[PDB]
Design a protein around this ligand. Sequence first.
Ligand SMILES: CCN1CCN(Cc2ccc(Nc3ncc(F)c(-c4cc(F)c5nc(C)n(C(C)C)c5c4)n3)nc2)CC1
Length: 263
Amino acid sequence: QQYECVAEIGEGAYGKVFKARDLKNGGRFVALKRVRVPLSTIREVAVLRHLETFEHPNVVRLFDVCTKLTLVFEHVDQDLTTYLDKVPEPGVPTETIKDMMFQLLRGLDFLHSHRVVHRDLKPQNILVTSSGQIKLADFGLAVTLWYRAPEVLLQSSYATPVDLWSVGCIFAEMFRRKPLFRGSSDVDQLGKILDVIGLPGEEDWPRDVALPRQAFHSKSAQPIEKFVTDIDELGKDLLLKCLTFNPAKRISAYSALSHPYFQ
Ligand SMILES: CCN1CCN(Cc2ccc(Nc3ncc(F)c(-c4cc(F)c5nc(C)n(C(C)C)c5c4)n3)nc2)CC1
């Protein structure tokens, strides 16, 4: 074969991800993702190859596709989880947070402008390169609920703002070094969210969902500087715009790129 698996990176309800030696290309490490056995899949692979033509710096490179399905990506040594675990006290430098967030938002805007929704954005699939570059992985192909948007939890809408809620959760965690909303179920996750942001207006609550606004009594919105210590005034404004309950009122990745926090 053209590839030689040397270690396992991950396993789950997708298949397995292996760290492999790319024999033909000077023995460089690559990440091979193996998938199961359609037509919606043919189309998803076509979008992946098309996104690769842009070679965006803030998404993992796709080097090959094999015929069950093998996806060959550029290998990157660590994820954001291991990065946050190893960073010395008192934490991630203030400008390292800003730079990683800008790159996260560039990769996300690239994906959103090409009508790809990530849907499972978390530190586990945000990869940190040897030179400190952010690269997005595990997207374009169809478990922790800590980064799930309220509209996904409520099962109402699944548009691009879903990823901006996840970004807000990641932004807060870059400061905290611990997840912001650590719920044990969809109902618990929603409860934990509203204990912080507060209850939205009855007209910001989606109609025809199973969970009504009355199922929660999470009274007032608590100040965010309590849960996210050391965040500046600008970072706080951007954090709140990502963590807006109504997805139609939530900031997009494109406007986030223009926010004064990145000046
Ligand atoms: C059990 C924990 N230990 C210690 C911590 N360690 C973290 C870690 C995470 C990622 C990498 N490397 C890497 N490089 C390039 C890639 F493109 C992918 C990649 C591609 C995909 F398509 C994926 N799809 C899914 C679902 N994942 C998951 C596997 C995250 C994908 C990952 N991964 N190296 C280390 C994992 C093993």
